[PDB]
Every structure is written in C-alpha cells, then in structure tokens.
Symmetry: C3
C-alpha cells in the first residue's frame, strides 16, 4: 500500500550511500551493484505512477514523483565518476520522460478545480529540473541548459497565473468568477506544455496574452466581462495545439489575434464593444482546432481576413466604425463556421 511507498524511499537513500561508498573503495563491483540498486528501484515507481495516473488518483501519484525525481540525483554521482556516458544518457531519458507526466498532473488540477495541488505540482517541476543542474553543474550540455532555463522559466511564471486566480476568487468570492478563475487557470496550464516544447517563444507570449486579461478584468469587470475574459480564457487556450502542430507560424499568429482585442477593451470599453470582443474570440477556439487539424492555408486564409479588420478598428475606431467592426466581427466569426464545417 502506502507502506510500499515508504518501503521504497529507503532503497533510494541506500543507493546514495553504497554508490558513494563503493566509488570510494574501488569496488566497481559494488559501484556497479549500487548503480543497480537504483536502476532496479526507479522502474517499480514509474509503473506505480503509470497505474496511479491510470486510476485518476492525484495525491499518491504526486508523492510518487518526489521519490522518483530524486532518483536522478543519485545516478548522477554514479555515471559521472564511472565516466560512462551510456549510463549518464540513461538518466537523461529517466528525467525527460519523468517530467513528461508531471504536467499532465497539473492539467486536471485546474481543469477539475483543485487549486492547492496546481501549486503542489510546481515543487516536482522545480525539484526535478534541479536534477539536470547538478548533472551539468560543471560538465556542460549546452543544448540541455537551453531547456532548463526555458523550462524553469515556464514553471515560476506558470504558477504566477494561479496567483491572480486566488487573489480574484478571494477579491471576488463569486461563482461567475471562481468558474473563470478555475478555467482561466485550466487554460493557463497549456502554456506549460507549449513552452515545454521546442517553441519557447510561442508560450512566452501565450501567457503574456492572458496577462492583459486580468489587467483588463480588474479595470472593467462586468458580468458580461467575466464571461468576456472566460470566453477568451479557454479560447486562447488551444493556441498551443496549433503550436504543438508545427503551426507555431499559425499559433504565434493565433495567440496574437487576441492581443489587439484585449488592447481594444479598456480604450473603447462599451457593453456593445465588449460583446463584439466577447464574440470575436470564439473563432480562435475554432481556428486553433483548425491549426490542430492541418488547415494552415485555410486558418491563415481566415486569419488574413481579420487583419484588414484589425486595421479597421485600429484605423476607424469611432462609434460608427467600431460598431462597423461589429458587423465585421460577425462576418469574421462566419469564416470559422465555414471552416469548422469544412
């Protein structure tokens, strides 16, 4: 049970001893035996985590990482002394595919409404990226450092999106607010998986778009703006499925489609201009399912339609032309219905 979880922690703390003890004894017979006391151990937890994540059980699969994550820092002191990069590039795959399912845990954290666990996942991601640090604290994998500095940057700022949620479910103890906050966070977890892939600038600017969402939500908070930011929360969310589809050319385009809209929020802040912005986003949630489908020449065919219209409200913002970008926003929202139907 959970006794076998504490029955495995000592085995890990038995490799950190026998590996440091057998490297200091010339016992490469026991240093290869202590290097086996860690390889024979970490797998029994990876199958335990795969079966716990299969049962939809969080708190145990969460405690299954902090023990399995530390298993790298012991195999680091082993494969560094023996010098075998075939046993060092083995802990590389042991940490990359480990933090793999660590973010799929932080998904249903906000996607199901657990807020004290979406901040408990950051420990693993923080204390597991530190397994590549001391692995290259002096060594040097130049391309690997270009990830942890773009990964650890994608954790601390990711948990920062969960900060305004609390300070807005506490500054606004409402259900029309704690539903957006739980979904404007269920939409912020995608920025993790969007900068955790090669495109680090795609999601650096993805959360940067959701940044102005709360700033335009604390400035003008309507019951039609709580749903304007919420219909834009889970709308810019799928801009990662466009970046996670080669279409970072269309995702960094799609994620930017809302930037000038959230900028046109507190300038011409009208209940008729909000419902034109609050109705302008829904196509992005359909154009992202189209760049997660493959129509980059049809998403950009519909994306190049709201550009001269982005140069419409920008050029012509007066009451009859921002309300003409209203009958033009409805026309732009029709290109998605002509594309979603396909």
């Amino acid at each position: 049970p959970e006794l076998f979880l504490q029955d495995l922690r000592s085995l890990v703390e038995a490799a950190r001893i026998l590996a440091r003890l057998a490297r200091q004894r010339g016992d490469e017979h026991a240093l290869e035996r202590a290097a086996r006391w860690a390889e024979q151990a970490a797998r029994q937890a990876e199958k335990l985590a795969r079966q716990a994540r299969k049962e939809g059980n969080l708190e145990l699969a969460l405690k299954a990482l902090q023990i399995l994550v530390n298993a790298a820092y012991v195999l680091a002191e082993i494969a560094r002394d023996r010098g075998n990069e075939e046993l060092l590039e083995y802990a590389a795959r042991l940490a990359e595919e480990a933090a793999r399912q660590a973010a799929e845990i932080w998904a249903e954290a906000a996607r199901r409404g657990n807020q004290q666990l979406r901040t408990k996942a950051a420990h693993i991601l923080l204390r597991a990226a530190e397994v590549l640090l001391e692995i290259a604290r002096d060594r040097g994998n130049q391309e690997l450092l270009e990830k942890a500095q773009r990964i650890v940057e994608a954790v601390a700022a990711a948990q920062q999106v969960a900060a305004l949620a609390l300070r807005l479910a506490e500054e606004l103890d409402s259900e029309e607010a704690k539903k957006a906050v739980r979904a404007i966070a269920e939409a912020a977890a995608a920025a993790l998986l969007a900068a955790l892939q090669g495109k680090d600038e795609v999601a650096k600017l993805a959360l940067k778009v959701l940044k102005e969402a709360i700033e335009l939500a604390k400035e003008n908070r309507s019951e039609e703006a709580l749903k304007v930011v919420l219909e834009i929360a889970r709308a810019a969310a799928a801009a990662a499925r466009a970046a996670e589809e080669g279409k970072t050319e269309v995702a960094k385009l799609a994620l930017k489609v809302l930037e000038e809209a959230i900028e046109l929020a507190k300038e011409n802040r009208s209940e008729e201009a909000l419902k034109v912005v609050l109705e302008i986003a829904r196509a992005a949630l359909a154009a992202a399912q189209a760049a997660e489908e493959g129509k980059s020449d049809e998403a950009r065919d519909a994306l190049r339609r709201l550009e001269e219209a982005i140069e419409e409200a920008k050029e012509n913002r007066s009451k009859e032309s921002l309300e003409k970008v209203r009958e033009e926003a409805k026309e732009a929202e029709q290109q998605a219905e002509d594309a979603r139907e396909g």
Copy 2:
C-alpha cells in the same frame, strides 16, 4: 490562505534553480531575472509576517519565517557570483531585520504560557544565523562574525533556561511552580534581546544570575522561596531595559545587585532571611525602570546605597546583623519608593 503559503515555497525553490542555472549559462539577463524572482518574493512574506504578528497569530507567523529565512541562502549564491556588494549588503538588511521580529515571537511564548513554541522559535534563530555563515564561509566580515558567534551563543543558552522550567514543572507539577517557571522564562527571554544588542557581556552575565536562581531553588524550595525566586525572576528581567538604554554601566551593575543576594540565600537560609532577600529584589525592578528612565545619577545614587550594605551582610552576617541588614534592606527598598515617585 495557507495555500498561498505553499504557493510561495515553490517560488523560493525556483530562484535557487534559475540563479544557479543562469550563472552557469552566462545569462546575467536571467541571473538578474532569477535575482528578481527572489526579491519579488521575500517581501510578500515580510508583509505577511507583519500582518500575522499584527493579528497575534503565532503558528502561521512562525512558519512565515522558515520560508523567509531560507530566502537569504539563495540570494547569497547570487550576490557572491555577480560580485556586487550592493546586492550582497541587501541580503544583510534582509537577515538582520528578519531575526528582528523573531525574538518578539519568543516573547509572548513564555509571557503567555506556550512552552512548546518557545523551543520552536530557536529553529528560526538557529537556521537563520546559518544564513550569515555560508555568506561568509569563505568571504569574511570580521565584525559580522563577532555577532553570530555572540548570537548563536545567545540562542542555545537561552533555550537552556527553558529546560529547567520543564524539569521543574515536571519535577514539581504545581501552579505555584508552573507560574514562576512560565515567568522565570518570560524573564529569560529578555536576556536574548540584551545580548542581541552590542552589549554581549551584559546578558551573558544576566542569564548567569538567573542560573543560581534554580540552583538555590532546588536546594531550598519553600513556598516563600518559590515566590522569592519568582519575585526575583521578573525582577532581574528589566535589567535589559537598563542595558538597552546605554546604562549597561547601570545594568551590569543592576544585574550584579542580585548576585550576592542569591549567594546569601543558601548560606544564611532563614525564613526571616529569605523574606529579607525576597523583599530586597523589588527595588531592582524599580531601579531598572529608572535606568530605563534615565536617572543613572539617581539609580547609581540608590545603587551606591546597597553597596556598603552589601559590605554589611558580607562583613556582619551573624543573626543580629543579617537581621540588621533586614532593617537595612527595608531602608534600601525605600530609596526606590523615593525614586519611583520621583
């Protein structure tokens, strides 16, 4: 709530990564960004601790230190590598004014009767002085080491005064004993703030006076001696407000006024000599409020009155002259009433 307390621990463990990761990448853009991930974090807890200590809430403001105390050991590895002593002398004020309110927590620990927390405060003071150690483990601030060696010495011995309290509230499970023990400890916390200021010898000998209190309390423990040591417990207490008033010349004099009295306790141990010692102390609790007032030429005017009387019981100790230092102790106790009235 307390979720934002765990939502801040990961942010600290995210600076210890990104600062060690960006110093090892030439990213003084991210090493100045990781040096900001710690500066933007520690303040949100210092205001949380100031608002928790404002509400009279212990256990949360106590857990607010162990996270805020560790914040120094991360900024140490930053300001040491960059070499900027304008960012290193910033963590100096971040640790000095931090342990500032750490002893004001241990005050109401015994001053309100919480004994398992007066020993929980020592962790912070011990694990926060260790933030100056690794900051100068090789560097070297010679004047700063002359504090931590006089500070850490003032913690371990301070928590030693709380040891006899337990072993006397357990060796004497009484209320006439657990009230003195809770006040002979509420009087021992002042020795912390008296050696934590420049005068390290003032309180080294202050607890050394309360040392013979329990030794003369385990030797001759009367119900009139439980109140003799208790009327001397919170009496020598205010000898710090004299040292914390420049008058370490009058405090180290006032703290020494009880030394020869506790020595005259188990030699001429009489219920008529106890009530002459048990009535000799109360003037010190009034002469300390006078050296905490400014009458160093009037406290020493009344202190130089019990000196030839200290040379009275010492010279003339026989039954008619220790009982003549009785009608002289009452005369000495009258100089405080002529001084307290002012």
Copy 3:
C-alpha cells in the same frame, strides 16, 4: 515529553552552526565550546533511547535515533578540523554503539507483527551508515569501509526480505500466510545481526537460503508447504546464534544444510516428500541451539550424519529411495533428540 524531543533538535542544529562558526573565527575556545554543545547533548538522548527501549515503546525510540544519528555528522566537521583523533575516535564509538540498538528495534518489528516499522528502521541504518561516509569521504579508514560496504549491503537486502512478505500477504491474504510472512520476516532480521558481525559471508548466504524459500513457495504452495517454509523460516533463523558463537564453521555448515533440501523441494515435489523435508528442518533449529551451546564436535557429529544422507537423496532419488531418505530423515532427526537431551 515530546516537547523535550523537539527541544533537543535545535540544540543539535546549534552545534552545526557554532562549530562551523568558531572554526572560522579562530575561536578554538568556542570551537571547543561548540564541540561541547554536541557532547553534552547526544548523551541525554542515548539515555532517553535506553529508557524508551526499556519501556517497549517503538515510535518514540525510533524518532530518538534520527536525531541522535545526525549528531555524528556534526562532530565529524569538528574533529576533522581540529585534527584530534582522540575526539574523532570518540564519534566512532558514538556511531557503532548507536546502530547497536538500531537492529534490536527491527527485531520485534516482525517478531511482533509491525510491518510498516520494519521498513522504517532501514532509514536509521541507512542514514547512520552515511555518518561514516562523510567522516571518511576523503580521510580513509580502510578497515572501517570494509564494514559500511558490508553493512549497507546488509540493510537494502534485509529490507528486501520484507518485500515478498507484503507481496505474499497481499498476493495471499491469508492467516496461514501472514503468520509465516510475519515469522519468515522475524527470521530474516537475524541475517542483519549475522552479517553485522565480522562474518559477512555467513549471513550473505543466510538470506540467500531464505531466497529459495519463497521461490519454492510461489512454485508449489501447499497448506503443508506454507508450514514447510514456516517450519524452515524460524528454523534457519538460529543459524546466526551459531555464527555468533565462533561456529561460523558450523553455522555456514548449518545454513547450508537446508540449501540442498529447498533444492529437493520442486524436483521431487511430493506431499510425502514435502513432509519429509518439512520434518527434516526441525533438527537445524535444535542443532543451532547446540552450536549456540558449544557442541561443535557434537553438532558436526550430527551434521556429518546427514551428509552421506545428503549424498543419499542426491544419489538415490527414485520413489523408494527418496522415501528411504524419509526413514533416514526420521533417523537424522533423532540425532538432535539425542543431542538436545544431551
């Protein structure tokens, strides 16, 4: 109470500061004072552990070790800098006689049926052997390393015997199984004390005999084989009291008396051959009390009787000669009754 247990943890963390602080200040007056803040502390717990182990209280005497075990790693940084091997060979006796009673705790763990604590004891043994590592991480006590590499090897494999117990009290949730499992573990704790003494090969092969017990128990598990392995569990157990009696010549002989029997288990697996093996072991539990008595010329006189009979079932295994090693096993079991009576 347990407040004095937390009132002692800070005192330990006050030596690790003042010893590192006074060695870095030339204060060999305070470095000898910090070396006293640890010597005056560790004994108050060793008497607390001796009085807790006297009261048969586990969880507190278990938490009395993790604090007392760490006390070595602080005195290591002291006696290494001062260079005095008369203060370094003092922490040697402080760690050897410490792990002394650490295994006598893991005894009644399974010998009384507590399975989640027999795995909690491994932490101490693992995190206390690591006190000799950093003590000789660079120094070098060649004969001492020949112990910790044979001690830490005797912990991780010892807790491995407790693994099959869970995976057989969970794979077979029975009382005829959870009684053997609690006794085939109460018999595995002796292998700890048998390789923790000079004879490291005596118990390396002792658990190696109990290894084939479960392998022959998962292959052919009868209700007469659950009692065959259980009557062999606590039978090979006392093969340590023979090794812990100089008679490692008779113990490594006695521990090997069951090897060829567990090998003759799944080859001629008969309910009439099981009850001949299940009745062949009981003499070992009586021949081990004879090598724990001193009759090495009478135990080997009875041990040299089952050798030509070991060369009987091996030579003559057919149905009439393994059943003739049946009427010979009863004859061999009679030499113990003629020896136990003495």
